[PDB]
Design a protein around this ligand. Structure first.
Ligand SMILES: CCCCCCCC/C=C/CCCCCCCC(=O)O[C@@H](COC(=O)CCCCCCCCCCCCCCC)COP(=O)([O-])OCC[N+](C)(C)C
Ligand SMILES: CCCCCCCC/C=C/CCCCCCCC(=O)O[C@@H](COC(=O)CCCCCCCCCCCCCCC)COP(=O)([O-])OCC[N+](C)(C)C
Ligand SMILES: CCCCCCCC/C=C/CCCCCCCC(=O)O[C@@H](COC(=O)CCCCCCCCCCCCCCC)COP(=O)([O-])OCC[N+](C)(C)C
Ligand SMILES: CCCCCCCC/C=C/CCCCCCCC(=O)O[C@@H](COC(=O)CCCCCCCCCCCCCCC)COP(=O)([O-])OCC[N+](C)(C)C
Ligand SMILES: CCCCCCCC/C=C\CCCCCCCC(=O)O[C@@H](COC(=O)CCCCCCCCCCCCCCC)COP(=O)([O-])OCC[N+](C)(C)C
Ligand SMILES: *[C@@H]1O[C@H](CO)[C@@H](O[C@@H]2O[C@H](CO)[C@@H](O)[C@H](O)[C@H]2NC(C)=O)[C@H](O)[C@H]1NC(C)=O
Ligand SMILES: O=S1(=O)NCN(C2CC2)c2ccc(F)cc21
Ligand SMILES: O=S1(=O)NCN(C2CC2)c2ccc(F)cc21
Ligand SMILES: O=S1(=O)NCN(C2CC2)c2ccc(F)cc21
Ligand SMILES: O=S1(=O)NCN(C2CC2)c2ccc(F)cc21
Ligand SMILES: *[C@@H]1O[C@H](CO)[C@@H](O)[C@H](O)[C@H]1NC(C)=O
Ligand code: NA
Ligand code: NA
Lengths: 420, 420, 420, 420
């Protein structure tokens, strides 16, 4: 004899080969379950010929007559001897056909968009104060220093004798010129002082007020930056279903009429019926029809699509903009199907389990689920301040030293134009 | 026998279900009172056929006719057999129809807009130190500078040679006068320092202690401001009905001739007389016509709305800038109405207590009153300090620059009088 | 006739009067349910005589013969016409006796020790650095300054000419004496500088290293104090059962074989069976026998005793070391009992509800549950730095200014002892 | 008919129940495998009488006799009928007894001690800025000070009269030499300032830009250190079995001749050969005798223990300094054993899948593997910075005080050579 093996088209499962050569038979197919049946027929000795299921399904009761469809109809009507396909071992299907013992473990977990890290900008040190404030601090430096200049020329006490070494007269002068009064204000703003230090009482009230103003500006820059950096460090992305249960900004997802949304119907867990309450409320928006459109929803919007774990690890690892957040929720298992009471059930159970002990079923999964390089290496770290978030203080340093050369040229010419 | 359950429409009690189809009947309705009624029909055995109430009214007795309107008129004339609805147990209806024991407990409570933190005060920089500390730092600046004056006089090593360029001219000068002693005190307080730098040992111990004092004050101002800006604890101006008795700025409000207005009119408690003396001797500014119009006036104006308790936890839950301040004022309950003398009063009374001890009567409330959830408990980024947050250092800058010109013209006259 | 009213001894319920006068009958008793039956007999016209229940209980099936005991045995055997007592309206008791409609609402909530606020001490500013560090910073000031003194006398470049005004010789001197080198180190430590500023290259390496050392000390004092003050502000006491469900440090409690622990048996809520899992694990330690010993466990240890809400509001308000955290979990109701099918059930239901509309049942609760003054006013606030947590910088300020007077006396004598 | 269920004792699978009493039988035992067995007997109809296994062994085949030991010897000789226990499905037992389908899924995983944060490094003050920034600040201090040298030479207004006491002696001096230009650069960087204070305009723009540069660096060091000390993100040195292949410092470990040791011996994967080449060519330092002895060696030493997966989530849960690093390595499952050919293999296979689809098979795991919980996720107070946290500023202090003496004796020779 030759066993009629019913299977379905899926990836990395039974596929077609990508060549032209239009005379294929039993070389037409290539996938995980073709490599599995190649290694089951090798050690059990049988020969096989693959015949795809006609009505493109896995199997379910249509409830109109209690007749199964898909692959498990061909198994229950003995039109097929095996079923090497992702036919998950479940309760209602166990009572009609007999499965082997699992060759793969799956479960419900979450697709999500891999965290696109926010570039802070190069000028991200300006952030702890609003741009209304950074302008009003600059207009306070041009304001107070033009007030201190007027008061220093108007007050008699600031006019001092610069020579205590020689008790003269008529040499009485100020040190607060227009340029020095700017240098007091800029010097006091940066908390590093200057060499002027007012002498009258009226110019010290301008001084002592500008010093109290300055402490509140620096201590509200340091404290708000220590609030921006401890909010960013305290927060964390979703890494579970519980953190996905609370935040209603992140939109959920499931296949309409599938085995994933069926789990949230029959669930009695208090964290999963809340997820069904989200899916029952926002239905027609969080209940997309298949696995293919559900990936395109995560790729565009803030979608959190719930599907099985073996077709996340395929999708995630050939598309490194996508990730798997959380762990396994359910725990299913793919099993090689047999008709009810078949002799090949006990041989394949021993044959699948022989390939696990010699490590075949991991070397086959790493051949088909691995894929390209996919640069995901991507050592994301945080909170150590680098060039990417404090680097614009290097630019305005360099922009201030280019400008100061242009004034040193402007000073060396202006002196020589006075001399000549 | 199908008994004719009467029903008024409230949310989330009895709503219109909407999917697509024209043909209807007993599937139009969903909510709390429908899940209550189908779980009583499961336990007691009866059948619905909910039919709605006419004249859209719960029940009241006319003042000149002496007749009833709505459900309790439909129950007294046996045009209904149950009244599963928000029909509150009161004295006048209990003498006319027969209620079951309560299935919900409620009272009068207060809506108010949730605290926002968008106008914290224009002097919000002043908050990280208590106003005891802001005075005791200023008295310490006056205290140390008076000690700096006293110590520097009779310390003989603070009497140096102020004439350094020539070797031994017998002149002596103390640069720690009364004016410079405050300027060292202010100058060291503002982390920038004067030009003085005391010189013996006894003014250096005063100098070194006031410097260590100043680090601990500034590094506690910067640290406590860093705590205020990442952990914002927003507190409401009102916390109970006693705090509304004093705040005339926050105005009351209730529905005209409702069950809430009737309670404050008939009360004898000293707070609830003061709450009624406002609401009676003011109208159309404080008394709304419907509670849906009253939810809007909290949302727009500065308004505190006195309404039923269980209507609040529905509206608060799906509008996250509305909160419930305080606790229950009144205490009443919702009862399934029955006609005046019925066998269905007792058998539902047992059936309500069966739903409450098994836990199903609480799980209906948790699914119909809960909504989005809106987790704003996670702190956002600290919302950069603008003229609404720091703000008042621009005032005390201008208040110091105006005061200094008064001293500038003040000490201009004192020298011009001295030169004359 | 005269109604035989069966009741039980509890507080603020039926008690004895505190006088001697040993000939009481029907004046023997004083409580809430005596004030209730005084106001029910007034408006219904009946006369009554109180007879206490003999076997000191409320009522339950003993399961040996299905015979009720306590008060509801005297009701079911018609030895009593009423039961005005805390006889909670529950399901198994409703089917044998008939209750009135509730005069009081109770529920399950939590006793807990009222938060005894931690006094930070007066020296709580020392906290951001360990006492090993504050000693090693003081020994670095006595270390570096005694290194800078040796290097300044040993290096030739620090020996400068103090007269550029007069190009002399032999007047070459240092400004780094032993006292000034201490004043550089103390002056640089406090981030406010001095008037010395080293001139050689060897004394600037000591200077530049002591300045880098100083920045790390101040920036680790400011950042650790901004971590001590944002952990204290972020944390919050338990204010629910969910916050009480997680923390296993806080020990739970319940009455053994009571109506409170029965609620956690039949619970299907995911946050309450976890509380039963704590009570099933640590039983004989969290399952004390009555309400009286359970209060004494909260008063000594970290106990979180679960009892009914009407005997928390009694205990909390006459003992202001105790508080009620969270809200109502269950929702029961105290009802005036009647025998099965009694005519007084419908009259008292109208009579209780008449006293609610004219506000008697709140004025009676505020007479018996109010109690003494009990200074609980206690306006607890936090995070504004006051005298109680930064006040020891006022003491060491004052201790440094007392010491400096004693050196100014020591300087004024030492000069005059040189002069004389 | 009572069928004789065999059983080995493991925790939390089958334990001894202890209350008080001597007389026993089928109530001695509680756990996962007993709650599994009484829920199979409810569904399938059968009865227990659990009897224990002799010789305390699961099952293995003797190498010289060719006989079995324990449960699978008790199943092959029909001295038992079920084997509800942790009896892992393997190839050699499947050829001898018949298993059901799995009820637990597990594999090989890694114990390691949870990260602690008690030795963060003695240079942990250096962390808030990246080592790119710590170099670029130092090059900017060298860069600006070389620009300060160049600009101050050919700027004519930096050439003042250094002889102020006498009016017009034609001497000129630039105080911005090469040595003072770095000292202004270092002095302004350390927030304390030199004695220079540039004087024209072009050295004031260099001065004012380097001052604004310095505020942003210090207020980002203080702010990011304030983020590190309140939000501590502790990360392990190892994250998978690939990271143990390189870390020879962290040593492996597994039970002698267990199911874990057998997997690494027979493997062909390149990581698991390197993990075995260590463990085979080292013994009694890396190979434990029992896994209880291996939990202790993680707890004491620096050790990473390779054991079964479901034994980890029991031990990790009730010892909160033990964690599971990585994921599952192997993949096997626990099966209810049956004799070689039985009608109870199929009917339990359906019954296990009935428990798994209803959700009861997961709720048994959540009640027997979960323990205390230990919420250390809430941040404690920041644990004051000692010599383990700041630490290395005491080294770079002493490294700068030793280097300065070398320059002090260095420039002592250079002047003594010049004077000669
Ligand atoms: C402790 C600190 C406070 C105390 C000191 C305060 C110092 C006074 C400062 C005053 C004004 C500072 C400029 C800010 C203007 C607001 C606009 C803005 O921020 O955005 C602009 C950046 O702006 C720049 O280009 C930064 C230039 C810095 C100027 C250096 C001042 C020199 C000191 C002289 C002192 C006074 C001279 C007086 C003369 C006598 C546009 O960039 P962006 O679009 O935002 O890109 C980022 C976008 N992203 C993050 C979203 C990705
Ligand atoms: C880095 C900082 C620490 C170190 C520096 C410490 C420096 C010592 C400072 C000591 C005193 C500082 C102010 C104390 C105010 C206490 C009274 C109060 O709380 O309310 C009053 C504040 O209204 C004002 O008085 C505004 C004045 C602010 C600046 C005053 C000093 C000017 C600088 C002088 C320079 C030399 C000073 C020293 C030499 C004499 C009333 O207004 P309000 O009620 O707040 O309205 C908002 C309501 N809200 C906030 C509730 C929303
Ligand atoms: C930004 C700040 C860092 C930079 C500046 C560092 C300055 C250097 C400081 C060095 C030592 C500081 C003393 C602390 C010693 C450790 C012991 C301790 O803390 O507890 C003791 C307190 O200790 C005191 O009594 C505080 C006295 C302050 C000293 C004033 C400094 C003088 C400046 C001169 C500078 C050097 C002179 C050199 C001369 C050439 C005992 O109190 P307690 O039992 O803890 O009570 C609280 C208990 N509770 C909280 C649990 C309730
Ligand atoms: C407020 C502060 C900001 C503003 C001021 C900035 C000042 C400019 C500073 C610039 C450079 C600062 C240090 C650079 C360190 C980078 C290398 C590194 O990361 O590791 C190396 C650090 O080993 C060392 O180098 C220790 C030296 C620290 C002080 C060096 C300058 C001394 C003061 C000079 C005075 C003049 C300086 C300027 C004039 C020239 C190797 O050791 P590790 O690997 O770390 O071992 C621990 C491992 N762990 C951390 C992972 C646990
Ligand atoms: C060339 C020389 C010119 C002169 C030099 C001076 C110029 C330069 C110097 C300082 C000004 C800085 C320039 C920036 C512009 C300031 C505007 C601003 O920020 O608004 C601030 C107002 O603060 C004020 O400026 C008004 C002044 C206070 C009242 C007048 C003084 C009397 C104070 C007491 C009487 C005693 C006085 C006597 C005591 C003996 C705050 O605005 P706001 O209300 O919070 O707006 C809300 C915005 N929101 C909607 C977002 C929430
Ligand atoms: C607040 O003060 C009370 C004083 O009664 C402290 O209560 C003591 O608590 C300890 C355990 O922490 C018990 O061993 C003592 O028996 C209690 N005292 C008495 C008199 O019973 C309480 O601990 C304080 N609060 C805090 C948070 O420590
Ligand atoms: O359908 S099964 O054969 N039996 C049920 N389950 C488990 C819950 C462990 C699992 C889990 C993983 C599988 F691969 C198979 C099965
Ligand atoms: O209208 S009732 O049936 N009887 C009176 N009361 C109260 C005693 C407060 C209450 C309290 C809560 C209810 F749910 C019902 C009633
Ligand atoms: O025993 S009852 O008459 N009916 C049940 N409940 C519930 C509201 C659930 C309540 C709640 C409070 C009561 F006062 C009485 C009752
Ligand atoms: O020993 S099995 O019954 N068959 C083999 N395998 C795996 C293919 C992974 C698994 C995986 C998980 C199980 F629970 C059981 C088995
Ligand atoms: C706390 O102490 C006792 C409890 O032993 C109590 O009687 C007293 O009233 C309480 N005191 C205050 C101030 O709350
Ligand atoms: Na079957
Ligand atoms: Na009635």
């Amino acid at each position: 004899r030759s066993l009629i093996v019913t299977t379905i088209l899926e990836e990395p499962y039974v596929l077609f080969k990508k060549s032209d050569k239009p005379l294929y038979g039993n070389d037409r197919f290539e996938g995980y379950c073709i490599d599995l049946l190649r290694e089951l027929s090798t050690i059990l000795g049988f020969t096989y010929e693959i015949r795809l299921v006609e009505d493109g399904k896995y199997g379910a009761q249509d409830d109109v007559n209690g007749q199964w469809n898909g692959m498990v109809r061909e198994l229950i009507d003995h039109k097929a001897d095996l079923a090497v396909a992702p036919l998950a071992i479940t309760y209602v299907r166990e009572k009609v056909i007999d499965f082997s013992k699992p060759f793969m473990t799956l479960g419900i977990s979450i697709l999500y968009r891999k965290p696109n890290g926010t570039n802070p900008g190069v000028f991200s040190f300006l952030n702890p104060l609003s741009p209304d404030i950074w302008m009003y601090v600059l207009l306070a430096c041009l304001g107070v220093s033009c007030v201190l200049f007027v008061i220093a020329r108007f007050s008699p006490y600031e006019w001092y004798n610069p020579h205590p070494c020689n008790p003269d007269s008529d040499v009485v002068e100020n040190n607060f010129t227009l340029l020095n009064s700017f240098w007091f204000g800029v010097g006091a703003l940066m908390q590093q002082g200057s060499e002027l230090m007012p002498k009258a009482l009226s110019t010290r009230i301008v001084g002592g007020i500008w010093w109290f103003f300055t402490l509140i500006i620096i201590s509200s820059y340091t404290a708000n930056l220590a609030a921006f950096l401890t909010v960013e460090r305290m927060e964390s992305p979703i890494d579970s279903a519980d953190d996905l249960a609370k935040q209603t900004k992140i939109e959920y997802g499931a296949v309409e009429d599938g085995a994933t949304m069926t789990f949230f119907k029959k669930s009695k867990i208090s964290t999963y019926d809340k997820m069904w309450a989200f899916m029952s409320s926002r239905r027609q928006s969080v209940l997309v029809k298949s696995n293919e459109e559900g990936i395109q929803r995560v790729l565009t919007s803030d979608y959190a699509f719930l599907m099985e774990s073996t077709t996340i690890e395929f999708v995630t690892q050939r598309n490194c903009n996508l990730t798997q957040i959380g762990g396994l929720i359910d725990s299913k298992g793919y099993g090689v199907g047999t008709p009810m009471g078949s002799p090949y059930r006990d041989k394949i159970t021993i044959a699948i389990l022989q390939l696990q002990e010699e490590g075949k079923l991991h070397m086959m999964k790493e051949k088909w689920w691995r894929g390209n390089g996919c640069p995901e290496e991507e050592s994301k770290e945080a909170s150590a301040l680098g060039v990417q978030n404090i680097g614009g203080i290097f630019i305005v340093l360099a922009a201030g030293l280019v400008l100061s050369v242009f004034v040193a040229v402007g000073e060396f010419l202006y002196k020589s134009k006075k001399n000549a």
